[model samples]
Every structure is written in structure tokens, then in C-alpha cells.
Target chain A: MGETLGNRIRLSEEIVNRAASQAMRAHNSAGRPFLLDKTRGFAIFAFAGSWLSDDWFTHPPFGETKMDASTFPSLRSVGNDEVAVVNASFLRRFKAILDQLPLEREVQKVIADRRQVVFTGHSWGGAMAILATLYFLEKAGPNQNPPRCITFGSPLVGDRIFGHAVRREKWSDHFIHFVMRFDVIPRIMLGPASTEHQQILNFFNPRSQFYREPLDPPLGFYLNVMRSASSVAIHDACILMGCTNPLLETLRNFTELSPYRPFGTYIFCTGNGKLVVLKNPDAVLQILFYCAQLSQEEAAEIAQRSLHEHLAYENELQESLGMQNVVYLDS
Target chain B: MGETLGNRIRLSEEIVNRAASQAMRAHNSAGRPFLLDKTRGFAIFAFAGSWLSDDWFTHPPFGETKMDASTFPSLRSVGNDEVAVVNASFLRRFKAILDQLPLEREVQKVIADRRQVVFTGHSWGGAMAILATLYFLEKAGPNQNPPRCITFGSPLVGDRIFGHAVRREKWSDHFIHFVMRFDVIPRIMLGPASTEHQQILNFFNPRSQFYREPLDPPLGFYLNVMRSASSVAIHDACILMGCTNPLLETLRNFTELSPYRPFGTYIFCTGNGKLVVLKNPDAVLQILFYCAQLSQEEAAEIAQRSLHEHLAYENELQESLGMQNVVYLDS
Candidate 1:
């Protein structure tokens, strides 16, 4: 199950801009770092990137966990007889938020009132938006308005089965993710999450309650993580591009591929004012792996840009919206 | 590059019934063996299965061939930068039909008038319908209404790139293939087309212009082909079912996999008033292989039913439409 050309719903510039700004607003919100508000005729739900360092302790858990149908009856069809796998940490975080708020009831009311719902988030917050939108769609059913989800630089949150279930239900197009070429967060899950990698990840979330004396990870440790990620991307990119290098293959033999896979259409900003929209999970995986790859001469610059790109989606998307050419890399 | 759950447009009972009956009408039309008519504001193009025995001499050609885009401009996007592979035999037969008729002009008129177009056929005719619908879609473009295709017992027409490109363009859903669980014709392309198998295949197309004095092959010869095909089906079916038999795997080691792969949503009538809808190409391939499988004790009966099932889609689909349950085997 996936998208078709005729019925494929495009992620327009207007929506991308709206989601980007909302993500920025959420990130700026020191109060709760989450938002639920009505704008025009739409109900917009926005989430800031993960702010806590402790979330990483459970963030890159070893394997996927099944969605609790008891908590989300509407997702029953998603798993059906087959077990659908989701990110355990993301589900736990999302459910914790739900436990404290009236989100389910609020979404139901929005559905009953016939208002369009849009969920937007960046980084780990984007993962939460994905879980939230899937739940909302099932609650709304076919008779009511369907919800839309837009995630920026979000890490993948499900295994192949979970992705398959979403496509099986034909809910994939309702979700779109915007990623800049060098954004390390989106492709971060593709590689193994070691303790050192976790430390580097925590460095990005300085506001985390778990932050202590060792506020910064060593520069060499950070570069090593970036090198590993860059290598993974290069390998994947070479596959879709239909070529291979002995070095990449040799490195791959020791690497363990992440179970996480992408589901929704991905809008990759190629930094050159071009946007490549891809829905094929296989191709998307490859694209994510190598989209930010550069020459060996600029290795340090590449590592620096990988993190820098994560915080620049709003600026890049804004520039891309003004550009006339947006390529659909279906082939 | 595939179908999603929410936006998935189903093959309704009404459309299934209509397409099935139209397939029957096309088969009954001895005059031209094809029908292009307008019913209820819809343009319906129907073709009878391969009417000539000579077509089989080229039928099941050893490998796939690239489509010639110079003749059909709309399909240029389908191949794009990559080469899209199609069945050489099917293309030859379809183009021969085009040479004898002004079908292209007739379809162009349908598009210019903005009428809803549907292409339907049975057996080899169904292959023609698939190609025809794809061409019509490109000619119609995104601004115009998309064409619909429904084929019964059609053979596989393209390889992976061909299928992927179609999905990339998002045209896969516009085409739907209906097969009875025991329909060997639809799954025939998965096996190696040996000369003996070709001879057995020609036996079914008695009306082929290439019919010669040696009208029939020996019974053992025919069963050998069936045995080869059934074994291949069992091998693939086991893969998707997530189980394996030593015998099947042993048989598979010697067998060459067919290049032809399926695109579009597949509707398999389980021959028990149950219908399974699958869109994932990999799963669809496995399901096609195993859908008609039965116990090993009924070897002769299994061979007999394979051919019989090909001719019985009209009745089975008609019966299934009246029943309520339709399982989406997405997971």
C-alpha cells in the first residue's frame, strides 16, 4: 500500500510555511513547548523538539513495541491480526502527554464539528505528531474530515510492519515530512544508537532535566558519530543511484541496519533551491542516507552542517517555496 | 511509490459487477473480439482474451523489452530516466490490434470530450487493457479525468522498474486486476517459459492464426508444465506466508525467477465467497503464487482447476459481489 500519481496529495508551500512557523513558535514556547489552538478554519497542533535529556535514555530503544489498541481503539485496523510496530519511547512520551491532557476528547470534538486538523512538530516532537495524527484519523473515520500531519526533521518512528499497515489503510499521504539535505536528526535513527551517540544527542537538548556537569560531549566523539552517519547515508545513496563502492560495502558488513523505516511522503530540500518529493520507502531511505554527503576534503564542514541543517528548515523551506521547480523523484 | 490506507479507493461491488459482465460480453463478441462502447456516461473499452494461437509462439517470450515512448508520448514519464520493462509478447499483440483499428483516435476523442473512460478485458486481452489504460492516463494528464482499468486473469506485463515507475507516477491504483484463486493465467508469467510450456500454452489458444497440424501435445507434457508452475507458486507463496517446505525450496533452486512483476491493486476471489485485496507488489506476487494452492493429494484436480479457473472469473466475481465480506490483506 502507498501513494498513486493521480490521487497523490501534494505538500503545498503554504502548508509547509504554516507548519514551519508553528514549529518555530512551539520551539520558542518556554512554558510548555506544545500548542493546541485554532487558526482560521483549522485546528493546529504543534510540538517543539524534544527538550528533555532523559528521553534519550529510552529514545533509541533496541526494538519496536506494538501500539496499545486498548489506549487507541481506532488503531485496531492498523495492526489487525498482524503486529504493527512503533517506537516504544515515542509512544510512551505521547501517551504520557495524553494522560495529562484532554487531547483525545479535543480531537474528537474537532472531528465532530467538521474542522480540519493539522499536526506539526520538529525533531522528536515530529514523532509525537505522527502518532497523534494516526490516532486522530481513525477517530474521525471516513465520514468526517481527515486530519493532516507535517513533520520537520523528524526521526522515523516505526518498523516496516507499522509502515505497511499505514499504507494498507491508505493514510500515508495525509502525513508529509520536510527534511533539509544535511539534517542529521531524520537520518539519525538509521544508524546504531550507542551510549556515546546518546551523549552527542543529549548535547542538542541542553534544557533537559537530566543535564549535569558534563554539559558538552568531546569534539572527537561528536565527529565520530557524524562520520558513522555520513557513511550510512553514502551507502544508501549509492544504492538508489545504482552504484557501489568496496569501502561502503565493507563498512556495511559490520553495521546493523535500524528497524525503523519511513512511511509518509518526504520533501527533501536539496539546499540548491530544489525540492525532491519521494514516497517509496526504499528510495526515501537511500535518499536520507546520502542526501547530505560531501567530499572527503570537507569532512569537518560536513559534520558541522549535519547539525546546523536541523535548525534551518524554516529558512530553507521558505526559500524553496519561492522557487518554481519542485521535482517529484518518482523514478 | 504505492497505495496508502485512507486514500485507497476500493473496487466497489457495482464496478466489479459491471467490469465482469463487460468481460463476458467481449468474450462472446465473435465478430471483432473487442468492444468499445459508452454506457451510463462512461466510455467502456473491452477486449476478449487472446483469440489467436499464433500469438503464443511469441507469447511468454523469454524476457522483457523496453516500451517505445516515441509512439506514446504520455508514457514517457513512466520510464523517465530509467528504462521501464514490459512483456514483449503482450506489446506485440496490443500493437497489432492498434494497427488494425483506429483505437487510439477513438480513445483520444473520449478524452477530449471529458468522458469517464474504463478499459476492461479477460486473459491476454486484460494485458492489452492495462497498457491501453496507462497510455490514456498520460494523454488525459492530471487536469483531465483519469482512466480506470479492470482486468480479469491478465498476465503480468512489466518488471520491477516498470512497476516502480508506475507507482512513482502514482498511476498504479487506476488499474485493478481481478483473479480467481485458481486462475493460473494471471500467475503464469512467474515461471520459466520453456518450449514445452509454450506448446502447452498454445493448446489453449486454438484459434491462433499460427495453429498447425500438431494440434495437441501429450498429457504428460502438459502436466509437466503445470507441475513446474505450481511448484514455483508454492515456493513464492511460502515466502509470503512466512513458512517454508524443503521440497519447495529444493525445486526453487533449479528454477529461474520471471522478470515480470505485478502493479496495481489485485483482487483475488478465494473461491469460497471471500475476497482478498492486496496492493504491496511483493505480497501480491506471493499471494498470486499461493492463492489457488490445495492439498498435494489432488494433483490432477489442481492441474485441471488452473485452466478452468481462468475461464470462470466472470461467474465468480458476479457471485462475490453479492456477498458482503472483502478482506484487505494489507498486513
Candidate 2:
């Protein structure tokens, strides 16, 4: 609440742009994701969302965190009670980055003062941001202010317990996620991977019970679909080669597929760059989904970029982060 | 307290024997697992663990449950609160089996006079038994006694939330997990899948912090080794494949690699075939580990198990089931 949605939007733009630039610098044009740093006291830690890479598509979408004692050092809670799980892939990279963090022994000596942490990312980056927020806050101390997470075109992360954990921690207020209408990056996990490769079917596969998910959907939509729960056709596995539903396989017998849920605030772009901020999960679902009866103009409003919704940063935010699209939360 | 360790040991043998037999009936000797019924009321539902099928090994090792809803037409928890997560793969097959369940109408009527539910299985089957027990009990009526989960070396099934949910549900007393000393299957998950497949490095991989699991050893020995939480590199992902280790990749952007704790009563089979029933988590980690110097005679007792300890049921249970050398739990 310190910064208005209008300012945060600009702040978000700055960080996310830097995220893209950081990614571009590290990945030689391919959309590989990882951590980015800032010298500012309140730091921004970012990651990449989705990519066209064979490795990117092949990576299992999730895995477990070091549940025992591998606490994200930044994470600390009630006298040391750490959050239980995290995205395994992100965490492996998470550890890699943490291992490289240099101590500010200068600040270490006076250690009482602390810096605020800001988490930002694009698609997968958003999910990582949500997780990093939790990881950091749990590890942050009485000296520092809690952190903020801002994501763009991100997918849902974690499960029911995780869903419960965030709400319990009251993290909804800290997260600000943006979803561009028709951005499959954010909505894709809502259903199982489409067995058929048609673009329309890929997003709204009629076969999946997960077709219009979180709208009375099972939390493990992707997992259940992969398992083909109902002997239903919609739940058939998605297999698109090259881009063939890359993360489609189950990976291992005891593989840990995370249960995901949306947390924090979701910013919905009405395609014409108009921003609609909705925090309620049901409301987010209603705004993100329920796309049936749109008129010609309404349908024409979405960005024409198709898959590029994930990449469109400034185009959509210009008006929203501007005062016109900003709607203040009730005082 | 009702049955001596010996009697319970004998009881466990009978149930697991029936479990393997049930599997034999359903799968064509491929080591695949299944669910079986007995007109007498007590039935066994089992699952196969580890496979060469690309799909088999790749299933998300764990996923969410309908924690909020009690789906078993037969189950009902005390009042309404329910268990949270379950092994996704097991639940997938579990639900499929649930859908085809026969005589629901007839069974529903006399369900008040509940049938004896004995959940049993080996390896993944054992994990299934634990989840199925939770699934069934939450749906079973109060008139029926709580179900018994006699599992043969189940990896820990759910996350901390799930672990707590089972205990809070007071299902701990119902679980009897049999662990053979030196079996990799049981301890393999306590840590992340060790990157190295080396036998020496596999069990003691220092890189993996999963060593010296549970400050206490529950099974008096091998069972404890597998669940090592503190750090002992014993967890080497079992690759039975052509396709094993596929989903073995992180199945999602977020997964709940359960922080497994040895719960319920652990039946530790000292390779010489003696059984130790330990319940305390702290104590469980101790007896299983801290064997800085296991003697030659003790080493000689394990039947050159190397890692074969997991398969020596008959050799260990020989006299217990009365068919001399009949492996009871091993039987």
C-alpha cells in the first residue's frame, strides 16, 4: 500500500524490463530463465517464465524443495519455522544463486538495518517471484520490512496446502500478478496439455475437465490430466513435438508434481491495455476465463500477438500503470 | 498393545502375502500391482512401484488430494475436516478403481455395519496403501473401526501438511511400515534423487544434504537410514528404465517432495530377520543411523543384500508364515 497501483505499475515496468534485459544478456536470444540482481538496497530478484528451448520444454514443470533443513537462507519464520516446499527446478537454481550471494560484512557488523526485497519476473518468473517472496519473508527478520512480488503473465504455483499457506501468511496483499487477456502462458496450466495441437483447442481443449479450471476444478489439473483421471478424452496427454507439450511427461514414479493455486493480486488486461485488478481467486478465474459471449469489438480488443501476450510488457502497461486504469483499494 | 510385535509381525505377513498374491492375480507377472476384493469383506488394493514404462516412472510422485471434499461414498471424517494431499499417481489409479467399484448400492445400505478395510501393498503399493487408508477412513463411517495400513516399505507419502494431517486424524497407529535393512527404495526419497548413481556415492552422497536422516531412527536400523533427514546420501533415484527418470525430472514448476518422517509404528527387519517396532521420530533416526562402526558379523547377517535387502522377503520371513521360509510380510 506504500506505493499506489499506478506507481507500482511503473516500478513493475522498470523491474520487468530489466528482467528481460538481464535474460537477454544471459541467454543469447533464447528465453532461458534465471536470477538477476540489483545493487539497490531493496533488491529485485527475477527469473524467466517460458521458452522454446528443447531443455525448457522438457523440464518437468515442478519438484520438491529441500524439506528437511535446506531453508532458503533468506526464509525465516516464527523462530525458524520454514515453509515446507518449493519448485524443485527453481530451488536448484535458487541455491546456485544463494551460494554466490556475497555478505555485506560492512552491514553485517551493524546488522540491525535491513533492506526491502522486491521480486519480479515474466511468466515463469512470476511463479518464481511468488515463491521467492515466501522464501524471503520466511527468512527475513524483524529488522526489515516484508517484501513485494510482482509478476507478469505467470502460471499458478503450489497446491491446496500451499494455497492455504499463502492465505494463512496473508501474502495475497503482497503479490501483484498481471494477466493479458488470451495470454495462454498464464492460463495454460488451468487445463491438461491438449493432445490436439490446434491453437484454440490447445488453450480450451474441450476434452479436459480442466478446460475452464479453478472454476470448480480439481487443484491438480495438470497432474490429474496426465494421469487421465476420468478415463475422459479431454484428459488425454498433450504431445506436441519440438514444442510438443514439452513438460507433458510424468518423469518418475515418485516424481513430485506440485499442486498449484493463484495467490496475491491478479491484474487482468482487457486486451486494449485497460487494466482490471482482481484479488479474489474466483474473481480472477471469472476475469481470466468466462470468455464465451464476447462481441466483435470486445473480441478485437486483445493484443493480436497470439503467444506474444507473454512478451508484451510496455504496450499493455502504458495505460493501466497510468492513472486512468488505476483503481485505488478502499481506504 | 493389543498384539505383540510377534503377532503383529505375523499379521503383517498375512496381509502383505495377500497383497502380493492379489497383484499376481491382476498383473501378468510383470510386477504391476492392483486392487482385489474378498467376499469375506477384508480386501487389498495395491500399486506397482518403479517401472521401465516411460509413463510409469514419470508419474508425479506426489500430488494433491480432494482434501476439502470427502469423495469416498463410504468415508466420513469425525465431523468434517479432511486430509489434504495424496500421491497423485496412486490417487489417479485409486480414483479410476473407485469409479468402477461394484455393488455400490448394495454396499451403501449395509455400510453402517462396515466391512473390514485392510490396506496393504509393497513399495509404491505401500505408499498407495497409506493414501488409500486416509482416503477410505475419511469416508468410512464412525461405526467401523479405523482401517489398518500394513505397508511393505512405503516411501513417505505426503508433505508435512499431509504428514500432520494423517497424524492429526490419528491414523498413525494404523500404519505399520516394514523396512528391510539396506533397501534403497525406502531411503531413496529422503533426499533429492542423488545425481551420482555410484553405489558408494549413491548412499553417502555428501553433496545431497539428506544424510543421517531423522535425528532419531524409527525402524531400529535400515528403515531409519532411508528416512535420513539431517544428511546422509543414501537416496539414489532408482532407474528401472528405458523411461525411468523421465518425470523423474521435476514434473511441475512446483512439487511437494514430501519431507518424509517415519510415522506410525515402523517394523524394522534386522537382516537376521528380527523385527523392531519403533514409534518415536527422534529415536527412529538414531537406531537406524549412528552405526559408525557396524561389525562384520552384523554385516554378514544381511544376506549379501548389498541393495537386495528390499527383495529378500522369503529369506527373512521363512518361519513366520509357517510354510517354512515363507516370507510373510516377506511372505
lDDT of each: 0.65, 0.46
Q: B-chain TM-score, every candidate?
A: 0.78, 0.60
Q: Kindly report, for each predicted structure in the order presented, the TM-score of its chain A compared with the true chain A.
A: 0.80, 0.59
lDDT tens digits, residue span B209-283, model 2: 345651222122432233233222111111111112232221111223334446667766653344555564433
What would the per-residue lDDT of candidate 1 be over residues A150-225, giving only the tens digit for each residue? 8988988987777877887888888889888767777766655655655556655525424466355435443333
- On residues B238-296, what C-alpha lDDT tens digit does candidate 1 reach at each position? 33333334422222232344667788998777756666677887656545533343433
* Candidate 2 lDDT over residue span A114-199, tens digit each: 44456677655566566656766676557666677777766666544455556676766777787765565565545433332233
* Candidate 1 Cα outliers beyond 4 Å, as residue runs: A1-12, A31-33, A57-63, A72-82, A112-114, A206-256, B1-331
Could you tell me the lDDT of residue B184 within candidate 2? 51
Q: RMSD of candidate 1 to the true fold?
A: 20.4
Taken in order, the candidates have interface RMSDs of: 18.7, 20.9
TM-score for each model: 0.45, 0.35
> Candidate 1 A-chain TM?
0.80
Count residue pairs with overlapping backbones in model 1.
Answer: 17
Cα displacement (angstroms), candidate 1, residue A146, comes to 1.0
